[PDB]
Design a protein around this ligand. Structure first.
Ligand code: GLN
Length: 235
């Protein structure tokens, strides 16, 4: 008998540092005054209010956020992040909150690329550290292209216009949203490499944050707010 408090005081109201991507619409992006908005931002904020925690959002970029989690610089991340078996070796994920995949894209009007078989001799780009980048490595010899990587979306999308790349790979719902946003894109082929998005923490860390995210997510699904948030961007 070394002592025990029979009146636990809850850790409610805890403020967590949460990393996210710089721009990854419709999941996170900024409005005209620089405020972060998007499906991920809204889901997280609604969950945080439901579960009585606070968020300090740290826009870092995708790979930068991944490395910040592993370096214990931030508590969690939400960044349209695919749950994968390999990532589960170093991250703990929430329940899934979106079904996604990858999409090949070229500049609008580029009739020279209508299939993956048309990538021979071309340069194809993706964002560093992403499922798209991994897909490019896996398929490089198969379709005989050269790879470029960019740190974030700004470089990746500029690449189709400035001579750097003939094609890019990015997430399917992001490219669909970009086409609807009037960007000069042509989508090629269908969804590849299905995955679902989760909130993430470093493996073995912040288990309460995962528990709260999962509870909040279920509550938003049950009460209709999940569906409304998605429709606010995807309708
Ligand atoms: N924000 C992103 O670019 C994420 C891309 C992809 N879903 C991944 O998890 O790698």
């Amino acid at each position: 008998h070394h002592g025990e408090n029979l009146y636990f005081q809850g850790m409610e109201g805890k403020k967590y540092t949460i990393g996210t991507d710089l721009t990854f619409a419709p999941f996170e992006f900024q409005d005209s005054k620089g405020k972060y908005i998007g499906i991920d931002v809204d889901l997280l904020d609604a969950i945080a209010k439901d579960q009585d925690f606070e968020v300090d959002l740290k826009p870092l970029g995708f790979d930068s956020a991944v490395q910040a989690i592993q370096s214990k610089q931030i508590d969690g991340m939400i960044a349209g992040m695919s749950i994968t078996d390999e990532r589960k070796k170093s991250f703990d994920f929430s329940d899934p909150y979106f079904d996604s995949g990858l999409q090949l894209a070229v500049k609008k009007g580029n009739d020279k690329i209508k299939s993956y078989d048309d990538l021979k001799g071309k340069t194809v780009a993706a964002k560093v550290g992403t499922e798209s980048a991994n897909f490019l490595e896996k398929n490089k010899e198969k379709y005989d292209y050269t790879i470029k990587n960019f740190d974030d979306a700004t470089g990746l999308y500029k690449a189709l216009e400035n001579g750097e790349a003939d094609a890019i790979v990015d997430d399917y719902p992001v490219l669909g949203y970009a086409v609807k946003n009037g960007q000069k894109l042509q989508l090629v082929g269908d969804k590849e490499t299905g995955s679902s998005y989760g909130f993430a923490v470093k493996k073995g860390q912040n288990p309460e944050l995962i528990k709260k995210f999962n509870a909040g997510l279920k509550n938003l699904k049950d009460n209709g707010t999940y569906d409304k948030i998605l429709n606010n961007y995807l309708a």
